[PDB]
């Protein structure tokens, strides 16, 4: 099944297993599950000081 990739700059390359969560896109026809960005192979977005839980980025502190 097709899957949306959330946020800025994904890093996935063809293979790489990733966790999948729910939520239709309501924009793309026939697409249904968001790739759990920040989990497993899908590295979180680069630079996300705000709302980082979604997008998998951790504390900006580092």
């Amino acid at each position: 099944v097709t899957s949306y990739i959330g946020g800025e700059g994904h890093n996935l390359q063809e293979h790489s297993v990733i966790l999948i969560r729910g939520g239709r896109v309501k924009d793309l026809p026939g697409v249904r599950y968001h790739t759990v960005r920040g989990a497993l192979d899908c590295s979180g977005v680069k630079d996300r000081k705000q709302a980082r839980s979604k997008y998998g980025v951790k504390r900006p502190k580092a």
Binding site: S16, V17, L40, D41
Partner: protein, 167 residues
């Protein structure tokens, strides 16, 4: 059995089985140490006794942990793992590419054996099986290969077409 062996820190007992032999690690199914059984995740320490146990052929010591990097380190056998993995999958995929490649053989250069001749001295080409083992596996990247079949030169008019291209 009487054979110590250095292993980079952070190493997992699974690496250890691969170190001795890939299949020892491939079909591997758990190992004890010091008379106590431990999970694959436990890192190896100071030259402790090994009490590994094996099985048959199926390998997945990290099929569900390889990329995860959740304890099953050192590129050693895992390198060998992708090998194994590909080997099987690629075999059936040989079959897929098999058919595909054949039609493309008769697509541009026409005829299987003719096109296979041009691939005889090809890219570390190996046996005719490796050919489809490559394309069927996708590790040869096409189109380049296609044009290579029709790498024919002539210019008995195309030389002036190269003039018409300039015109």
């Amino acid at each position: 059995k009487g054979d110590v062996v250095d292993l980079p820190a952070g190493s997992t007992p699974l690496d250890f089985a691969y170190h001795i032999h890939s299949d020892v690690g491939h079909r591997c199914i758990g190992a004890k140490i010091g008379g106590r059984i431990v999970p694959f995740t436990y890192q190896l320490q100071m030259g402790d006794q090994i009490e590994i146990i094996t099985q048959k052929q199926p390998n997945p010591s990290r099929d569900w942990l390889n990329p995860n990097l959740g304890y099953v380190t050192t590129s050693r056998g895992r390198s060998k793992i992708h090998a194994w993995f590909r080997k099987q999958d690629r075999d059936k995929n040989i079959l897929a590419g098999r058919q595909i490649l054949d039609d493309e053989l008769e697509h541009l250069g026409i005829s299987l054996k003719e096109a296979e001749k041009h691939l005889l001295p090809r890219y570390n080409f190996n046996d005719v099986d490796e050919l489809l083992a490559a394309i069927g596996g996708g590790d040869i990247r096409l189109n380049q290969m296609v044009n290579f079949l029709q790498s024919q030169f002539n210019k008995p008019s195309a030389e002036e077409q190269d003039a018409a291209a300039l015109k």
